[PDB]
Structure 1
Amino acid sequence: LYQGVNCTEVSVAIHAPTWRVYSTGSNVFQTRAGCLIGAEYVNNSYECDIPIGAGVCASYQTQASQSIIAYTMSLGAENSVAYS
């Protein structure tokens, strides 16, 4: 996570230039905490495993393609009480 950056400035500087020289290519994605490169965003929702910020968590989950997925957290299950 490059914290505090638009995902279109780590691309147009990775094409030198950025400090940390070591590079990486996988799946850029803009969160409200920064740019996550290396993790795919699902649309499902699960409990928090590794916090990242602003509602987003990450985890190593099979797909047995095992990779690091990113998702928005679930605050719990649903339940309506039969009030009459």
Structure 2
Amino acid sequence: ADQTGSNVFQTRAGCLIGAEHVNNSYECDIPIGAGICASYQTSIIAYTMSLGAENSVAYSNNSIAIPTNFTISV
């Protein structure tokens, strides 16, 4: 017994000991499986990965968005 504790959490990929579950969602740091990721933010935390920042383009049948500048990226 390499060391069963109190932070026992059940994942679909297995069941994870030593990491606490938080109800937030962050970018995936350490992939565990089945949508669960782990990260260090201080204790080890285990959450559900966030796909990306939510967005909603302001679609309208008579509106366009045209850029007024630019940027050179290497």
1:34 aligns to what SS in structure 2? coil
Paired AA for residue 27 in structure 2: E
Task: Report percent identity of matched pairs.
Answer: 92
**Of residues 50, 74, 78 in structure 1, which corresponds to 2:50?**
74
Return 5+ residue gaps in structure 1 as ranges.
Answer: 1-20
The residue number in structure 1 matching 2:12 is 32
The residue number in structure 2 matching 1:3 is none
**Of residues 22, 44, 48 in structure 1, which corresponds to 2:24?**
44
2:36 corresponds to 1:56: yes
| Displacement of 1:24 | 4.6
| Displacement of 1:26 | 3.8
After superposition, the CA RMSD in angstroms is: 1.2
| Displacement of 1:78 | 1.1
Indicate the structure (1 or 2) with the bigger Cα radius of gyration: 2
1:36 aligns to what SS in structure 2? coil
| Displacement of 1:79 | 1.1
Count the aligned residue pairs. 60
| Displacement of 1:74 | 0.4
CA distance in 1, matches of 2:7, 2:53: 30
Q: TM-score, normalised by structure 2?
A: 0.74
